[PDB]
Amino acid sequence: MFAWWGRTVYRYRFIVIGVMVALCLGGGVFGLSLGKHVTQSGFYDDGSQSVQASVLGDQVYGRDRSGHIVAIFQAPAGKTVDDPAWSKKVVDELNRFQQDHPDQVLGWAGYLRASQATGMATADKKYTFVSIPLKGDDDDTILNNYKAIAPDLQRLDGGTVKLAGLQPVAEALTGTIATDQRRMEVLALPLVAVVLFFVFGGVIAAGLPVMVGGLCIAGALGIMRFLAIFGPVHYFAQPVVSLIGLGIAIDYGLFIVSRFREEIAEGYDTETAVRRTVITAGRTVTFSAVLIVASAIGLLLFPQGFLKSLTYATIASVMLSAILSITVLPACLGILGKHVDAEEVEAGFWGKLVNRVMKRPVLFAAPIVIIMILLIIPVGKLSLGGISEKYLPPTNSVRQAQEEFDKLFPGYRTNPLTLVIQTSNHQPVTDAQIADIRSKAMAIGGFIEPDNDPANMWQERAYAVGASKDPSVRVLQNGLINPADASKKLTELRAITPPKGITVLVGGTPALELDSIHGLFAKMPLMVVILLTTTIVLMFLAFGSVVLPIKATLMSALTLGSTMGILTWIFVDGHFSKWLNFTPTPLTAPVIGLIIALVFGLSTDYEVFLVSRMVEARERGMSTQEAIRIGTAATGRIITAAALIVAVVAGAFVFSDLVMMKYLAFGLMAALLLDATVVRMFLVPSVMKLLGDDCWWAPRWARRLQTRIGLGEIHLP
Numbered sequence: 187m188f189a190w191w192g193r194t195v196y197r198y199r200f201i202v203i204g205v206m207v208a209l210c211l212g213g214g215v216f217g218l219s220l221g222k223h224v225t226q227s228g229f230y231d232d233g234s235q236s237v238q239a240s241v242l243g244d245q246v247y248g249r250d251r252s253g254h255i256v257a258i259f260q261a262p263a264g265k266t267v268d269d270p271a272w273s274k275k276v277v278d279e280l281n282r283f284q285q286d287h288p289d290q291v292l293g294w295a296g297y298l299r300a301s302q303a304t305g306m307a308t309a310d311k312k313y314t315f316v317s318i319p320l321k322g323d324d325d326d327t328i329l330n331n332y333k334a335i336a337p338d339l340q341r342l343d344g345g346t347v348k349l350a351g352l353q354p355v356a357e358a359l360t361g362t363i364a365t366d367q368r369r370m371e372v373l374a375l376p377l378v379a380v381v382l383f384f385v386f387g388g389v390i391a392a393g394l395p396v397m398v399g400g401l402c403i404a405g406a407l408g409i410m411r412f413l414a415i416f417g418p419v420h421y422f423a424q425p426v427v428s429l430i431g432l433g434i435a436i437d438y439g440l441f442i443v444s445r446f447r448e449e450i451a452e453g454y455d456t457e458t459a460v461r462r463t464v465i466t467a468g469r470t471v472t473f474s475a476v477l478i479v480a481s482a483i484g485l486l487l488f489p490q491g492f493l494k495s496l497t498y499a500t501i502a503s504v505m506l507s508a509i510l511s512i513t514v515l516p517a518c519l520g521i522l523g524k525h526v527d528a529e530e531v532e533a534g535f536w537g538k539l540v541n542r543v544m545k546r547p548v549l550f551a552a553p554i555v556i557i558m559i560l561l562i563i564p565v566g567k568l569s570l571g572g573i574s575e576k577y578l579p580p581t582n583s584v585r586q587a588q589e590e591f592d593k594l595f596p597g598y599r600t601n602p603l604t605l606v607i608q609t610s611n612h613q614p615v616t617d618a619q620i621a622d623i624r625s626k627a628m629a630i631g632g633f634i635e636p637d638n639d640p641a642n643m644w645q646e647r648a649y650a651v652g653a654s655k656d657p658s659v660r661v662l663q664n665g666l667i668n669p670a671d672a673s674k675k676l677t678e679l680r681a682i683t684p685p686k687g688i689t690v691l692v693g694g695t696p697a698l699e700l701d702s703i704h705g706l707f708a709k710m711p712l713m714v715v716i717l718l719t720t721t722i723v724l725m726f727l728a729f730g731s732v733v734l735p736i737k738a739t740l741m742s743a744l745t746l747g748s749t750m751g752i753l754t755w756i757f758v759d760g761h762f763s764k765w766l767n768f769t770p771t772p773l774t775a776p777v778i779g780l781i782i783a784l785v786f787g788l789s790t791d792y793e794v795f796l797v798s799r800m801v802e803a804r805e806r807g808m809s810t811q812e813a814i815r816i817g818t819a820a821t822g823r824i825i826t827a828a829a830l831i832v833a834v835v836a837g838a839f840v841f842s843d844l845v846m847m848k849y850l851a852f853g854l855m856a857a858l859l860l861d862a863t864v865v866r867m868f869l870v871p872s873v874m875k876l877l878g879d880d881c882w883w884a885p886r887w888a889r890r891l892q893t894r895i896g897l898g899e900i901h902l903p
């Protein structure tokens with residue numbers, strides 16, 4: 187299979203270099219429209235009882251267009267907001283902004299308009315705000331409408347106004363993606379180019395992995411844009427495409443180009459060198475890519491629309507990177523030939539480190555597993571959470587505006603729990619039924635009494651403009667003090683016994699996050715099984731042995747545990763926050779699953795890169811110890827360079843202004859730092875020496891089944 191592609195990618199090395207570049211360049215110019223069609227919805231289990239409640243509330247009671255924009259106005263530096271002139275002109279400026287953007291601005295209500303809104307002006311009368319509703323029946327439509335007016339909105343009062351609310355914060359959160367890509371393009375791509383020049387020594391040899399990575403990120407963006415035609419694609423799709431199309435899409439090029447240069451040095455002519463580098467390195471790259479696919483395919487079981495799009499992005503990027511690395515790059519090398527330049531590796535440093543590692547293997551593995559289990563201890567205080575304005579750096583000037591709004595006008599932002607009363611007959615709900623449901627619900631403590639009286643608790647929702655006043659659905663709502671009691675009292679609410687025919691759905695933003703967390707935790711028992719079973723079999727196919735898949739699975743699990751522990755200790759416990767410019771916050775549950783999948787997949791890739799050389803050397807008659815020596819001395823520099831490349835790519839994203847991407851990239855950095863600077867150098871050789879000659883053992887039926895498939899060719903005569 188791989189020994190046939192090596193022979194057919196050289197006979198037609200132009201029809202593969204001119205067609206697979208067309209499909210990635212003209213297919214990448216199609217992805218330039220991806221930024222418009224990416225959505226921000228998908229963090230919630232769309233089949234839960236809280237999403238149902240939110241949809242019914244929006245349908246019947248109309249969307250809550252009150253927190254979209256709040257614009258804080260300040261007195262004329264030694265005056266009050268009740269100034270006859272200043273108030274008049276701020277009015278006369280909010281008018282002619284409502285009417286000069288009629289397609290985006292629904293209206294505006296504030297103290298400057300109605301004097302009966304004393305809750306919209308501070309007690310000293312020096313700060314006031316107005317609420318600007320935005321037209322749009324979809325969240326992304328509302329965000330686009332806000333983006334169409336934001337540059338002209340800030341000019342009110344003369345630049346003095348401060349914008350806050352749902353839409354400015356959403357714009358700030360989604361506006362960090364462009365900044366991240368700009369930082370990547372101007373800081374990591376040239377730095378990765380310099381790293382590639384240092385590892386290879388030529389501009390042509392170093393250029394080829396960059397070309398493959400660029401083609402991968404163009405084609406993956408094109409594929410994602412194609413996927414956005416049918417379903418929703420999240421905003422996080424493109425940063426992950428960048429990560430996985432410039433870290434591993436460049437690792438694959440590194441390995442294949444290095445293998446080609448190794449085969450050229452042996453004296454093999456151009457065609458034979460291409461065939462052999464395919465047979466070995468392209469096979470290893472293909473197995474690494476399918477291992478990533480297997481690791482990240484389990485995310486398809488989770489109901490979050492965020493994860494279902496991020497897994498598509500990951501799968502598309504890795505498959506395109508592998509296809510490029512086995513189609514275009516071998517053709518690029520076959521055309522170039524010996525012009526890419528334009529027993530000592532095993533006797534140097536890498537061959538002498540794993541000669542002390544295997545001489546006292548317990549001393550180099552027991553301390554490391556001990557110090558790598560102690561890194562798991564911090565994960566106990568995980569405390570997942572949700573997205574808010576605090577996912578921005580404390581100096582964002584938008585988070586600052588929102589925090590100043592919260593300080594000045596407390597009580598306006600409510601985070602209520604909503605009970606959706608709904609007759610099964612589709613009949614007008616009797617006001618006595620709402621009374622009985624409220625009476626049952628007015629027996630659970632921990633809910634915000636507005637004026638310390640029961641008569642205003644569990645108030646009915648307000649009818650908005652886009653409200654279809656269905657008489658068979660009524661919704662009540664209260665916020666709760668101590669948001670930590672959300673999980674404890676959501677179950678207390680969901681245990682009410684409706685009187686005769688009512689069916690109460692409990693929703694609200696606090697419930698929307700707990701439902702997503704529980705929906706994600708209800709499929710870990712099967713997602714983990716899939717992630718383990720699909721990688722064990724694939725690594726048995728890659729390494730014609732049974733013990734090695736188990737060993738690599740154990741090391742990958744240990745690396746994942748240590749990475750999660752470090753992430754918790756840094757981002758949840760709040761260490762190095764002042765250095766990295768973030769606020770210690772609860773993590774997001776879907777991103778934890780994404781981190782698990784990516785870390786497991788990439789650690790397994792690095793294990794495959796390390797052990798494929800050992801398996802290849804063993805088939806050449808080498809003993810078990812020599813197999814390890816050659817295997818991890820021939821690939822030491824290449825794996826170090828690949829780890830540095832991905833570390834640079836992720837560290838370009840660690841400096842992001844979004845905490846989500848910060849700890850995603852930092853988890854990747856920690857995982858690869860461990861897997862390339864502790865695991866590879868000490869744990870794998872020591873364990874493989876302790877196991878003995880049984881590292882290479884697969885039953886006879888297993889190897890003949892591997893041959894029947896056609897994937898067993900790990901030996902080059």
Ligand SMILES: CCCCCCCCCCC(CCCCCCCCCC)(CO[C@@H]1O[C@H](CO)[C@@H](O[C@H]2O[C@H](CO)[C@@H](O)[C@H](O)[C@H]2O)[C@H](O)[C@H]1O)CO[C@@H]1O[C@H](CO)[C@@H](O[C@H]2O[C@H](CO)[C@@H](O)[C@H](O)[C@H]2O)[C@H](O)[C@H]1O
Pocket residue numbers: 226227228229230236237238240241244252253254256325350351352355356359360363421422571572573574575598599600601669695698
């Ligand atoms: C790379 C970028 C990708 C996107 C990045 C994320 C962008 C998305 C924005 C995220 C977001 C706006 C955040 C801004 C808040 C500012 C409020 C200012 C108000 C000023 C007056 C809304 O996010 C949207 O929420 C919608 C429904 O909730 C949902 O709509 C759809 O949902 C369904 C289908 O998804 C379906 O039912 C249906 O189709 C739709 O209904 C959208 O899908 C979803 O995007 C989160 O809201 C915030 O979350 C916080 C929970 O932590 C919450 O509590 C915080 O504050 C409390 C203090 O009180 C404090 O106690 C808490 O401790 C604190 O945690 C906040 O109160 C809340 O505001």
